[PDB]
Nucleic acid binder design. Structure first.
Ligand code: CMP
Length: 201
DNA sequence: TAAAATGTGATCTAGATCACATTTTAGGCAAAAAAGGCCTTGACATCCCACCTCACGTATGCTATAATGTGTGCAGTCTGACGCGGCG
């Protein structure tokens, strides 16, 4: 259907894991699409500490904020959650096929609207809640993300203390201690990498 | 000038620090073994085949008082023109 006509035009590259997608500040000259896999968008500070922006699954056009004004840059890092086949688009051609077909910026209305909605409650939560609420609702939303697997009492997922410390804006063993308290509160099971939340659905 | 904004500062309060030992656990590399894919075996079940197989059916033969030329149930006749064979 629609997607067939647009993949008919695209140029593709295969991405290994562990590496960089976007380099912040450089010339933004291409839009991409997640052909297969998952990715983690994030950003550094002056000191170099990472702080995660989000994860992203299938159904995502990628590297879009540079599409629009002449002479823009990359406003964030994007790092490998997994190995990912990824597409290629130029911007003059973006003018061409937005003009002869308006459904792609209808799609990008979809995705970008989701992204500043989810970001709207990212910052909205970033003001007020406490670390309990931060990591709690974090792992709720990751329980909504399809990367988690089904456990017969809920949802299981595999992650370390460091990266969730880079989610909620605090240190890793802090979330370790309140995590073990949360175990003692009987709302999770937890063996090392593999953690599980019940109460889903 | 009504009504919202602006200083008192001492007394606190949930997380970050910070070097180093110990887990784990990947993830991914070598693989043991089991369960399909490959074949076989024994055992069964059902036949196809045909090979027979007797009962019932069927092809054929005579019957010696004597008897000896149909018909047989119909048609109802339409009619005007054209060929042809007699017909003088
Ligand atoms: N708040 C956000 N939500 C989703 N994606 C983002 C956000 N900020 C940056 N990005 C992505 O990170 C990319 C970095 O380079 P760009 O600015 O060209 O395009 C950006 C987006 O694709």
């Amino acid at each position: 259907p629609t997607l067939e006509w647009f993949l008919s035009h695209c140029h593709i590259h295969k991405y290994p894991s562990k590496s960089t997608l976007i380099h912040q500040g450089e010339k933004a000259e291409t839009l991409y699409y997640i052909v297969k896999g998952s990715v983690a968008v994030l950003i550094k500070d002056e000191e170099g500490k990472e702080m995660i922006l989000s994860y992203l699954n299938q159904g995502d056009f990628i590297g879009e904020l540079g599409l629009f004004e002449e002479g823009q840059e990359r406003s964030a890092w994007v790092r490998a959650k997994t190995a990912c086949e990824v597409a290629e688009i130029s911007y003059k051609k973006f003018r061409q096929l937005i003009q002869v077909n308006p459904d792609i910026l209808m799609r990008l209305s979809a995705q970008m609207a989701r992204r500043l909605q989810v970001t709207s409650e990212k910052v909205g939560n970033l003001a007020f809640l406490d670390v309990t609420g931060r990591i709690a609702q974090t792992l709720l939303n990751l329980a909504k993300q399809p990367d988690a697997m089904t456990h017969p009492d809920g949802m299981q997922i595999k992650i370390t203390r460091q990266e969730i410390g880079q989610i909620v804006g605090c240190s890793r063993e802090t979330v370790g201690r309140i995590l073990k308290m949360l175990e003692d509160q009987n709302l999770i099971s937890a063996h090392g990498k593999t953690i599980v939340v019940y109460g889903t659905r």
